[PDB]
């Protein structure tokens, strides 16, 4: 609990950096700025006011425009949302990073803006911390094809991918041009400074219209690794399929829960006439699928369960030579024989005592 | 790990970029990547090497791109747009260097920034003798009719290969060949080759004719002796080319499938059940030759071409036509084993000859199974 | 020396000198003449390709030629990324007349956009029907009072020709009071030479004269034809237009890219969305009169021969098809080809015993169709 050392009479972007310094000195996870209200910081679950002035819609608009460009205000007034990234160096020391989100709300009967900065770590966690089977590590760096991390949002998939990239990039003799396309650019790799790799990070609302546009653009840049934050629609899926067929590792995430179910989503994304071709493409290209789920622990902290299949040459052949109409079933069997089920990982964790009995039984019930 | 340019400026200016480029070519770079907050990189033989020790500034890069494209280029990047263009320049020698350039906006250290990428554009088809090709391929490379597939990953030099084939069929006297090629982006041209009795028409598919398939269908209207289709991805183009071959025209195409048997599987599966059997017979009858090509590092730190090929003799084709169509893939495997040449076999031969590294050999063996 | 130079080669090539050069090429018995930017004019005589000029033509010359053949805006059309197909006739000093299919396509020469034109010689007159070697069934079925006749098959199966022959038969005979309207896109066959009494033939080219094949048919409905020729019916639009024309009571003749009578049926029925498609299907069944799928297969003589699988849609066939379940029309049709029609395989067999096709080829046909 503190107050800002030198609050300005009016808040200008220059002062926002100082305010952020103050918040970090307090160890704030999050900083919330709203028009009708003082600046708030959340330290350790408690919300504290870090300024004794209520800001103004003009001030907030200025802040957001500085952070995300001249048209940010107009974008908010159009009825859109802003997600971006903000970073600063206080004085040639360490650097401060943030995921920033501006949204329109209604304050005192008038349109206004609310901007939220969430502290994001500087470097992706190492892969060893992720606690991954050896199978996955062997499957994690294919020459070509698609790697999918699936699960409901807040499963920490972005973190995982970020980590893989770090691993793939940091090592010597990894001559990899990496191109990522991210809605919000969660992670940066400037600190890692690998010997023979480059990472170019393009933010989708700011730098390039679309995720699909992004990938198709990557095809023109001769990357060795392509990161697409999400592939929700069939355009992005098709772009990524071309990139993979072209011969480039593609890494993406999906909202689907379950490797077989994931397959079903991929195949159905396309109309009937396209769907057979599209399916052959997908089966050919896929290399690895992981569905991650964050579940509460006995310690009241979160743990990652994971159901994965590695799509070996053998698996891929099985799927391609078989009747396509039932890929979904086939994959379901294959995860059982060559992969790892969500229920199985849940049981392992339960025997380890990491998860509660009730949670385990829940997972078993859902998987049924 | 890092081969530096000779005369590195304090701040990088378009004049120097030209100098920087010649150097990269001297190193035999395919691609040059310039990014803010990073040194200039060149890809030589799949390895990335830094061409300078100095990290370029955003302003420098903006200047470069403005020079290559236009004054408004930086703004356009600020727009949230992508730049694709080309850059040519005339060295000391005068014979020009040219590149496909692409500038895209990214975020570097919290600030908007630019990345430019320059990709070398080959011009002149190799000679076929330089390709190092078995004789049984050379005998089979000029069928009267049917389809010749060069398959492999992008950047395996299949474009170069078929360019070389075309050169060979064009430059020989008494080769009365009207050649029509349809390619995504035209890379190889045949104006420099002198011909006595051949014509080559090159149509670019985004610019000149909407589809590859359209392109082929157009070729039929042009009545040439040889048809080149850059890629044959979907069942449309495959069907077009099947009609072209059934009519009586050599068709040459590429696929991204890895393996003769696998390529077969892709071709056959392209088609739904009711069309599927007919289409399959068509394919089997029309096929004349399949080469899957793979570029693999050598002892002297360069690259070499391994090839797994089958020549589809009349006998082979009969074998395939007699059999169960669902067993077409397997039968094809057997046929590459008996009458063709496997990727693994080529890898072994190269290893015994000392061209490929032991490690590399092992790696190759791993993949095929 | 594989060069046969043009008698009076101009300093720059202009359309008239194109006519003269064409004369020269005919004198050499050239099948095809290809003109390209940055290249001399070539003519193909039999196997051989021979340059007819020492000068390589400039892009502007070519553009002028094509504009002369196909309208001021031909160049711009090429630059759009489109492809030009048309037809070019010219009359020597002789009363005789020269006809070609012309095709112009855009290509890249020396790094610049350029043009390639190709003229392929066309005969003056459709073959006779008797030359076509058609069963008597088909000849009886070839001139219905109303309904649709489909000639289907892959490109290069000579369906266009066969159509031209039918039309020639129907216009040549006396007391055949037929106004014939064709919508051919590239017009390949002309009927000027036949010039018979009691028939008129109006041939409209689809790129040049009328936007679309469907537009073309709908236009024919306004002209009181007795016979309508549509080059192709890919669209549901064109199919619907032709269905209206047939329902009104006009013979319609078209081609399809599909292989097999049953398959052709499948395509026709599937063209239409679900709410429309049952009605659509009744219409189709009622209207159809004849389906011929044609395939050109090599002969022992190293020429080609035409195999045909046809069904004639008699009143009774049509009844069978209408009375049964709409959704399985394709299968019922499949059986009806077997029972009342003629299969590709059977024709292949008859040809083989006759010794027209080789064992291998016939063997192949059995393999594909049998499926």
Numbering used by the authors:
A (entry chain D): 6 to 373
B (entry chain C): 5 to 373
C (entry chain B): 4 to 374
What do the authors say?
The dot/icm T4bS system of L. pneumophila is powered by two ATPases: The membrane protein DotL, which is part of the coupling sub‐complex responsible for the recruitment of substrates and their delivery to the secretion channel and DotB, potentially involved in complex assembly and secretion. Here we present the X‐ray crystal structures of two DotB proteins, one from the dot/icm system encoded by the L. pneumophila genome (termed DotBL), at 3.19 Å resolution, and one from the dot/icm system encoded in the plasmid of Y. pseudotuberculosis IP31758 (termed DotBY), at 2.75 Å resolution. DotBL and DotBY subunits display a very similar topology. A DotBL or Y subunit is composed of a ∼150 aminoacids long N‐terminal domain (NTD), comprising 6 β‐strands and 3 α‐helices, and a ∼250 aminoacids C‐terminal domain (CTD) consisting of 7 β‐strands and 10 α‐helices [Fig. 1(A,B)]. The main part of the CTD adopts a RecA fold and harbours the signature motifs of the AAA+ family: The Walker A motif between β7 and α5 (also referred as P‐loop), the Asp Box on β8, the Walker B motif on β10 and the His Box on β11.
For the DotBL structure, two identical hexamers could be built, on top of each other, while only one is present in DotBY. The hinge point of this rotation is within the proline‐rich linker. In the hexamer, subunits A, C, and E adopt the α conformation, and subunits B, D, and F the β conformation, yielding an overall threefold symmetry [Fig. 2(C)]. DotBL was crystallized in the presence of AMP–PNP and ATPase activity assays using DotBL preincubated with increasing concentrations of AMP‐PNP show that the analogue binds and competes with ATP resulting in an inhibition of phosphate release. Yet, we could observe density for only phosphate not AMP–PNP. The phosphate is clamped by the main chain NH groups between residues 158 and 163 (TGSGKS) and by the Lys162 side chain. In the vicinity of this binding site (less than 6 Å away), the side chains of Glu191 (Asp box), Glu235 (Walker B) and His260 (His box), together with Arg221 (in α6) from the next subunit, point towards the ligand. Overall, we concluded that disruption of this interface by mutating those two arginines leads to disruption of the hexamer.
